Ligand binder design. Structure first.
Ligand SMILES: [Mn+2]
Ligand SMILES: [Mn+2]
Length: 544
């Protein structure tokens, strides 16, 4: 029994992160690849497939293996059923908190951020229905990242509804530098005091439209973070927990630079850590994503920190959890009007459609194919390599709710523009230098944009300017001076391009629904357009 655990410690943290508004049970496969430059290979955040199972001592075919790796995915999805769903997550959280309290324990419900956005329910209520669900379950704290794509005003509004206490040491006014929210909160846990410090994603300005966060700075400030930890302890905190949305590698670097952080609950990177990652004098536990798991962290505290801890990744399996009737009732009420829109099949996929990967996915290829089919003049389609999304099983129907799960940006516009061949290589080399940075302190936690219509060779360990080679567009060598017509959504690439005259940008999801409804069935087979030097590029089994 995964959920039946004996008591342990003075305090229990019930933690999830990066739900990305996923209201319903769904499928979410881990990436087939998490390519690292040599210096970073074999670390948590860079483990996939069989390697991840071995690292954590997880047996193949188990519920944990199903959550942790792409290995046997389709087979395990049919065996254990879908993951997540606000209903099941709520039921699990409620079960766990009741056990702990009945033990005489103290349980905190911590949300790592990236909760309010990127789903049908979210887009339909501009995030509000997600905030309401949060209040139903009882979230004690949360940090943020994508929340800000709602715009400063809407966030300000929703925080008025949010019953938990929002934290962040780094969101400050861009002129005066005064923090807008509390950096941390101290909770009494028996005779001890536990401080929960919050950190929001520091790269919000360059990752989303600048207008969403005008007047704010989210910059990483070690001096300021260190000072908040020092203050928490001065005020009585025995132990310090960082509820983070920096990204796990950045969290790791901080563990070696900041003093006094005992545990980091790492969001943003969508990682899974069945056993805590020990860095310096800190333990790190990742928050997974899309509601697939509830991390239960039991702490035995001492006057100077965390003496020991028990970490359990609890799978959120809807077929094996009781119902949270109030959550189910609330969702039916919230989405009754939109049932037909959200859940009517648009098309049936014959193969596995997955999103997560360093370089390539079948979902993103489907999108490239959809764009080219509707805009035949397009030569290259740049798809955003976000880590949020969903997974479609073979024979499963694709719905609007799925489209919003995959492309539910608040700025979902597809842009058509010309790029010179030299800009194409430069863009890839640029992304490559960010993703394959050998220094974790500079890591931003993203993947490489998928470019449909081109093929290339990548050397993660080559010097900057030399990582991308042998570029080919439409079966011919890349010509640096030729103007290629490109398409791109969810990013900023259009800013350096020459807009296609006569084209009016429109939401990527409209283009996809139009395509899907027409073809009725899709069968995208994995055909990676990249060759990785020094690495074995892996693929999942897409049938079954
Ligand atoms: Mn996220
Ligand atoms: Mn994030």
């Amino acid at each position: 029994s995964l959920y039946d655990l004996p008591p342990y410690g003075d305090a229990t943290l019930l933690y999830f992160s990066d739900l990305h508004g996923q209201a319903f049970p769904h499928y979410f496969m881990e990436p087939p690849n998490l390519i690292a430059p040599k210096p970073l290979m074999g670390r948590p955040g860079y483990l996939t497939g069989e390697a991840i199972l071995r690292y954590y001592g997880v047996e193949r075919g188990t519920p944990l293996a199903y959550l942790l790796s792409y290995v046997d995915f389709v087979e395990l999805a049919r065996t254990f059923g879908p993951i997540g769903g606000m209903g099941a997550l709520t039921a699990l959280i409620r079960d766990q908190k009741a056990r702990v309290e009945a033990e005489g324990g103290k349980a905190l419900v911590l949300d790592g951020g990236d909760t309010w956005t990127n789903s049908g329910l979210s887009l339909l209520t501009r995030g509000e229905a997600v905030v309401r669900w949060q209040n139903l379950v009882g979230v004690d704290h949360m940090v943020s990242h994508w929340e800000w794509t709602l715009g400063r005003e809407r966030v300000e509004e929703l925080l008025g509804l949010f019953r938990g206490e929002f934290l962040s040491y780094n969101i400050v006014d861009d002129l005066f530098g005064d923090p807008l929210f509390p950096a941390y909160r101290i909770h009494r846990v028996g005779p001890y005091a536990l401080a929960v410090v919050g950190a929001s994603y520091p790269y919000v300005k360059v990752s989303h439209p600048e207008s969403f966060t005008e007047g704010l700075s989210f910059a990483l400030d070690e001096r300021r973070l260190q000072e908040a930890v020092d203050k928490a302890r001065a005020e009585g905190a025995n132990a310090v927990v960082l509820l983070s949305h920096n990204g796990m590698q950045l969290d790791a670097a901080l563990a070696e630079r900041i003093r006094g952080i005992d545990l980091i609950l790492s969001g943003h990177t969508h990682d899974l850590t069945p056993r805590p990652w020990r860095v310096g004098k800190t333990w790190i536990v990742a928050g997974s994503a899309a509601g697939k798991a509830l991390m239960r962290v039991d702490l035995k505290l001492w006057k100077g920190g965390i003496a020991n801890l028990r970490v359990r990744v609890l799978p959120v399996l809807a077929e094996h959890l009781p119902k949270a009737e109030d959550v189910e009732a609330f969702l039916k009420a919230q989405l009754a009007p939109h049932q037909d829109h959200l859940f009517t099949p648009l098309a049936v996929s014959e193969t596995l459609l997955y999103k997560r990967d360093t370089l390539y996915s079948t979902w993103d290829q489907l999108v490239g194919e959809a764009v080219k089919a509707i805009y035949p003049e397009v030569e290259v389609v740049f798809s955003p390599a976000v880590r949020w999304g969903t997974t479609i099983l073979p024979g499963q129907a694709i719905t609007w709710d799925h489209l919003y799960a995959y492309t539910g940006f608040t700025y979902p516009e597809l842009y058509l523009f010309y790029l010179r061949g030299a800009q194409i290589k430069a863009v890839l080399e640029d992304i490559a230098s960010n993703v394959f940075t050998s220094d974790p302190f500079y890591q931003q936690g993203g993947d490489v944009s998928r470019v449909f219509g081109l093929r290339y060779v990548l050397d993660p360990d080559a010097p900057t300017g030399e990582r991308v080679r042998e570029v080919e567009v439409g079966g011919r060598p890349l010509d640096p001076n030729r103007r290629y017509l490109a398409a791109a959504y969810g990013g900023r690439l259009q800013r350096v391009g020459e807009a296609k005259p006569g084209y009016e940008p429109r939401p990527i999801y409209e283009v996809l629904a139009e395509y899907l409804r027409s073809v009725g069935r899709v069968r995208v087979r994995p055909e990676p357009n990249v060759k990785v030097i020094g690495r074995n590029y892996r693929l999942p089994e897409v049938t079954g």
